[PDB]
Amino acid sequence: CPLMVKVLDAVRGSPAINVAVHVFRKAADDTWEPFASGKTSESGELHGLTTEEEFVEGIYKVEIDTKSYWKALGISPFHEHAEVVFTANDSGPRRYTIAALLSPYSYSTTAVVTN
Amino acid sequence: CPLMVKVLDAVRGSPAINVAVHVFRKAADDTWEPFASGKTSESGELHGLTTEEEFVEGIYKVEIDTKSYWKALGISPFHEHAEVVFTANDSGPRRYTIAALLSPYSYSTTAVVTN
Amino acid sequence: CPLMVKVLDAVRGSPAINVAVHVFRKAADDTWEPFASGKTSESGELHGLTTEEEFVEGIYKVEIDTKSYWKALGISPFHEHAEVVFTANDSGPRRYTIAALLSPYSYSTTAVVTN
Amino acid sequence: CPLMVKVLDAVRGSPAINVAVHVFRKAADDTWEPFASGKTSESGELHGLTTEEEFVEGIYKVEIDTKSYWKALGISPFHEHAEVVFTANDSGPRRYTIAALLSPYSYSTTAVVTN
Numbered sequence: 001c002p003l004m005v006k007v008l009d010a011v012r013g014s015p016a017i018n019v020a021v022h023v024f025r026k027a028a029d030d031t032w033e034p035f036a037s038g039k040t041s042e043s044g045e046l047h048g049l050t051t052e053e054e055f056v057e058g059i060y061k062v063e064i065d066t067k068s069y070w071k072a073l074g075i076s077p078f079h080e081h082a083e084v085v086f087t088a089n090d091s092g093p094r095r096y097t098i099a100a101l102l103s104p105y106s107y108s109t110t111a112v113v114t115n
Numbered sequence: 116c117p118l119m120v121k122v123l124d125a126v127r128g129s130p131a132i133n134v135a136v137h138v139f140r141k142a143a144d145d146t147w148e149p150f151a152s153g154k155t156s157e158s159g160e161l162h163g164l165t166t167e168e169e170f171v172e173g174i175y176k177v178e179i180d181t182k183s184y185w186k187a188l189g190i191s192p193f194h195e196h197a198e199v200v201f202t203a204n205d206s207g208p209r210r211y212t213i214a215a216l217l218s219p220y221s222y223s224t225t226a227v228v229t230n
Numbered sequence: 231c232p233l234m235v236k237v238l239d240a241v242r243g244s245p246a247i248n249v250a251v252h253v254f255r256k257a258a259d260d261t262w263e264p265f266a267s268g269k270t271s272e273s274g275e276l277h278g279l280t281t282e283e284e285f286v287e288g289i290y291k292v293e294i295d296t297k298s299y300w301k302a303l304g305i306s307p308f309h310e311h312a313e314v315v316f317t318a319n320d321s322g323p324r325r326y327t328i329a330a331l332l333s334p335y336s337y338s339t340t341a342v343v344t345n
Numbered sequence: 346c347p348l349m350v351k352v353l354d355a356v357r358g359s360p361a362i363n364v365a366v367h368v369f370r371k372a373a374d375d376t377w378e379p380f381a382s383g384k385t386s387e388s389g390e391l392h393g394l395t396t397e398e399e400f401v402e403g404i405y406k407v408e409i410d411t412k413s414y415w416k417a418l419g420i421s422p423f424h425e426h427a428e429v430v431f432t433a434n435d436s437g438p439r440r441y442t443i444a445a446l447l448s449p450y451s452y453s454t455t456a457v458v459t460n
């Protein structure tokens with residue numbers, strides 16, 4: 001599993017559960033092509049988006065539907081979604097964990113790249 | 116000034132100077148149309164992107180070109196850029212300050228909205 | 231003004247107003263001695279804590295009373311307070327801006343140091 | 346395991362390994378009494394600090410020696426250490442994960458409280 005997404009709720013101090021995540025890969029004509037999607041689990045995690053074979057070098061975009069999450073909690077948010085755009089590899093494939101720390105008017109995003 | 120962007124370097128503890136910023140607005144046909152652009156000053160701030168008249172209701176994307184910034188400092192960062200996507204002025208005109216806190220493998224973004 | 235504190239509310243996207251701040255300095259006997267205190271203004275900022283003359287070299291602790299802030303807004307937060315502990319002026323006098331970004335179960339803190 | 350600490354390096358996008366962590370419990374006379382300590386593992390995690398039996402309600406302080414971490418990497422940091430001060434329980438015991446996201450001049454800290 002080369003790509004994992006994790007989402008935290010900073011208001012409740014909990015995993016952000018059932019958050020939709022859409023992954024896109026940048027095509028040769030500079031457009032965003034749908035690549036993978038899912039929703040975070042009870043632990044706020046999303047695994048099995050892709051495989052090592054399919055996760056080739058290139059620019060990827062991870063969109064996290066933060067607005068719908070806050071809407072379900074009855075809390076007015078600022079952002080439409082959180083966006084994480086990055087180049088897969090320098091490098092030689094390894095494991096990418098993208099984490100998103102959510103607040104209604106702020107978010108932090110981190111990348112842990114491990115062997 | 117209804118839209119301001121501020122960028123901080125969390126490695127040096129200093130304003131992030133000369134950071135390129137591109138702003139887009141979502142058109143009726145669902146495409147991102149160029150809206151405004153500029154670079155942060157010596158104080159890490161970018162003003163004068165737009166006017167109250169031109170800053171109508173809509174969905175805006177603020178793209179902060181973080182990769183270029185880090186590379187010039189000799190750092191190969193994770194993200195291509197920081198993205199901040201939000202609905203603006205849907206309850207009348209407001210003033211928006213978008214701040215970004217930059218690390219090579221992480222960023223935080225905040226919004227302060229005033230009436 | 232060599233020491234400034236700024237506090238942001240990440241739930242409301244606004245300055246955190248009337249937040250109590252206590253500053254301490256480490257004495258030669260290793261105890262924390264009261265150095266200065268105040269509360270953030272309507273802009274979320276606290277100035278005039280000290281002077282260049284009184285702000286000598288040493289280890290300082292800035293205690294930001296975040297729990298009291300959240301409770302008044304009807305929120306039971308995780309942290310008692312945010313702490314920021316740092317050596318100051320060990321390479322000559324500097325100006326320090328300490329910022330805190332507050333969420334109920336998370337905070338970020340930054341420092342901008344200028345000569 | 347009622348108390349877990351996790352430390353991330355935001356410059357390298359990696360677990361922060363071999364970071365010293367000291368835990369204190371607030372005594373009746375308002376002093377900090379040493380309670381538990383350790384160093385983060387290769388995964389940047391510290392488990393087995395305490396037991397459910399010993400981890401009674403009260404105020405705790407988790408000190409993360411961030412300065413020594415950056416020093417070993419040859420990077421000049423701002424903070425002496427990161428401090429996380431919190432009340433264990435409202436509530437009825439459960440699991441506390443304290444995470445710290447480290448940059449040389451900034452840190453974020455989060456709490457995930459789970460059943």
Ligand SMILES: O=S(=O)(O)c1cccc2cccc(Nc3ccccc3)c12
Nearest residue numbers: 006007008015044099442444446455457
């Ligand atoms: O690791 S934990 O805090 O246990 C954690 C537990 C459960 C869900 C999480 C979701 C996103 C990030 C986390 N960690 C995190 C926190 C701060 C910065 C980066 C990642 C989550």
Ligand SMILES: O=S(=O)(O)c1cccc2cccc(Nc3ccccc3)c12
Nearest residue numbers: 121122123130159214327329331340342
């Ligand atoms: O405010 S200051 O630290 O003075 C600051 C000074 C200079 C440049 C800054 C750029 C972006 C954000 C800041 N503040 C900030 C810090 C944390 C959260 C949100 C905004 C900047």
Ligand SMILES: O=S(=O)(O)c1cccc2cccc(Nc3ccccc3)c12
Nearest residue numbers: 212214216225227236237238245274329
């Ligand atoms: O700069 S602004 O967002 O205008 C801002 C406006 C009003 C109050 C603020 C309080 C603390 C930090 C800020 N900025 C900040 C944001 C991110 C990182 C560091 C500092 C505040």
Ligand SMILES: O=S(=O)(O)c1cccc2cccc(Nc3ccccc3)c12
Nearest residue numbers: 097099101110112351352353360389444
């Ligand atoms: O969960 S991961 O990113 O995989 C992660 C992996 C390895 C070490 C980590 C250390 C601290 C926080 C993490 N997460 C985190 C990130 C952002 C906010 C809160 C916690 C760590």
